[PDB]
Design an enzyme around this catalytic site. Structure first.
Site, PDB file in Angstrom:
ATOM      1  N   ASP A   1       0.660   8.507  13.939  1.00 21.83           N
ATOM      2  CA  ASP A   1       1.901   9.085  13.399  1.00 21.83           C
ATOM      3  C   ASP A   1       2.514  10.125  14.340  1.00 21.83           C
ATOM      4  OD1 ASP A   1       1.783   7.471  11.156  1.00 21.83           O
ATOM      5  OD2 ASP A   1       1.590   9.121   9.712  1.00 21.83           O
TER       6      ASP A   1
ATOM      7  N   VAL B   1       0.800  -1.217   0.000  1.00 19.44           N
ATOM      8  CA  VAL B   1       0.000   0.000   0.000  1.00 19.44           C
ATOM      9  C   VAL B   1       0.835   1.271   0.000  1.00 19.44           C
ATOM     10  CG1 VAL B   1      -2.208  -0.849   0.842  1.00 19.44           C
ATOM     11  CG2 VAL B   1      -0.361  -0.433   2.455  1.00 19.44           C
ATOM     12  N   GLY B   2       2.097   1.234   0.407  1.00 13.83           N
ATOM     13  CA  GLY B   2       2.883   2.454   0.394  1.00 13.83           C
ATOM     14  C   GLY B   2       4.282   2.212   0.910  1.00 13.83           C
ATOM     15  N   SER B   3       5.117   3.233   0.723  1.00 15.61           N
ATOM     16  CA  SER B   3       6.504   3.214   1.160  1.00 15.61           C
ATOM     17  C   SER B   3       6.924   4.634   1.496  1.00 15.61           C
ATOM     18  CB  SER B   3       7.436   2.645   0.084  1.00 15.61           C
ATOM     19  OG  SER B   3       7.042   1.348  -0.315  1.00 15.61           O
ATOM     20  N   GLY B   4       7.728   4.763   2.545  1.00 14.16           N
ATOM     21  CA  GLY B   4       8.343   6.028   2.886  1.00 14.16           C
ATOM     22  C   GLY B   4       9.789   5.809   3.272  1.00 14.16           C
TER      23      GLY B   4
END
Ligand SMILES: Cn1ncc(NC(=O)c2ccccc2)c1C(N)=O
Ligand SMILES: [Cl-]
Ligand SMILES: [Cl-]
Ligand SMILES: [Cl-]
Ligand SMILES: [Cl-]
Ligand SMILES: [Cl-]
Ligand SMILES: [Cl-]
Ligand SMILES: [Cl-]
Ligand SMILES: [Mg+2]
Length: 348
Positions: A164, A26-29
């Site tokens: 977060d 679903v995502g990467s950071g």
């Protein structure tokens, strides 16, 4: 120990217990990579985060420890909690990867403030839940440091969770220019004129509440100084009492170069809003941080009369942050992290 299985998803190796099925990227950071999955033990849809380079330096190893300690402590309906934490390593000596598991979140507050017509009832309930979670967080002497709409999860029943936490991560570049990363920050920390403290989170809540009422960002500055000018036009320049308190000489020198301005009438700014909402905003958006309302005080404000229940607004267990002042080697932070992974006990 559970059995683990391996798979490559988007050129990343995922090694996870069998209970987690149907992994989907679903995502990467810079923090890591995240997959959605189905947890067969609990029946929840979950987010699984694989940390990227968790022990590459002393700073990064201490940050990994900090995140795991914070997530293991948070047990509250309006705050993200930890469903699981695991490593495929069988001993400290082969320990390298850390995976974190939480409930899978859909929309954030951005996905509703831009797309919905909010009644005053909606604003009441959303800000109530933020303050309920913040009372809990602040009671453990934790500061969130990064409250903004993209860090607030909301579902179809208007239920909200704070996400977060600020892990002392944001760079100077990320705070530069016309950027939402800075629009919710208190004036006294935007240029580091004061140390972080819990009152900066209440400033953020005021900025969020204003935006839910109007549909517009309150202080969308094009840079730090433009933003400070927008803030001082609304809340006034410092009075004699606050001037005496201001400890930063850099703050005093620049602030006194500006022409003095009175605080504006908030009823002429937030046209058509509930008078009780305006009153609460006046108590949050105070330039003097010592004088802002606290989360516990705000929960008792008449704006929340429909939802306030002092028997259902819990505080947190004590949280020992003495590690923050400790100087350790990489492998010592790594061993502390390993101990916290293997001691995890899941919620009922
Ligand atoms: C003791 N004290 N109370 C409040 C406060 N400062 C401020 O609230 C402030 C606000 C805007 C810009 C700069 C400072 C201080 C201080 N140490 O400066
Ligand atoms: Cl399993
Ligand atoms: Cl949660
Ligand atoms: Cl490992
Ligand atoms: Cl945001
Ligand atoms: Cl300070
Ligand atoms: Cl003047
Ligand atoms: Cl503790
Ligand atoms: Mg975020």
């Amino acid at each position: 120990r559970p059995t683990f299985y391996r798979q490559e998803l988007n050129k990343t190796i995922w090694e996870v217990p069998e209970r987690y099925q149907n992994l989907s990227p679903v995502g990467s950071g810079a923090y890591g990579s995240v997959c959605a999955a189905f947890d067969t033990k609990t029946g929840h849809r979950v987010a699984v985060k694989k940390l990227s380079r968790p022990f590459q330096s002393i700073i990064h190893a201490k940050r990994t420890y900090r995140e795991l300690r914070l997530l293991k402590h948070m047990k509250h309906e309006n705050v993200i909690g930890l469903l699981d934490v695991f490593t495929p390593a069988r001993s400290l000596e082969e320990f390298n990867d850390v995976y974190l598991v939480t409930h899978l979140m859909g929309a954030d507050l951005n996905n509703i403030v831009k797309c919905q017509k909010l009644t005053d009832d909606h604003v009441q309930f959303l800000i109530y839940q933020i303050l309920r979670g913040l009372k809990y967080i602040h009671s453990a002497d934790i500061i969130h440091r990064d409250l903004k709409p993209s860090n607030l999860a909301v579902n179809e029943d208007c239920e909200l969770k704070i996400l977060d936490f600020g892990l002392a991560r944001h760079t100077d570049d990320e705070m530069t220019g016309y950027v939402a990363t800075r629009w919710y920050r208190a004036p006294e920390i935007m240029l580091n004129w004061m140390h972080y403290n819990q009152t900066v989170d209440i400033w953020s809540v005021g900025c969020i509440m204003a935006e839910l009422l109007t549909g517009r960002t309150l202080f969308p500055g094009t840079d730090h100084i433009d933003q400070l000018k927008l803030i001082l036009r609304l809340v006034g320049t410092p009075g004699a009492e606050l001037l005496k308190k201001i400890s930063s000489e850099s703050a005093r020198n620049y602030i006194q170069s500006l022409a003095q301005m009175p605080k504006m009438n908030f009823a002429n700014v937030f046209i058509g809003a509930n008078p009780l909402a305006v009153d609460l905003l006046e108590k949050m958006l105070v330039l003097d941080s010592d004088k802002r309302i606290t989360a516990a005080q705000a929960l008792a404000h008449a704006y929340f009369a429909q939802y306030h229940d002092p028997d259902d607004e819990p505080v947190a267990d004590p949280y020992d942050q003495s590690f923050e002042s400790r100087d350790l080697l990489i492998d010592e932070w790594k061993s502390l992290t390993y101990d916290e992974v293997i001691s995890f006990v899941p919620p009922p």
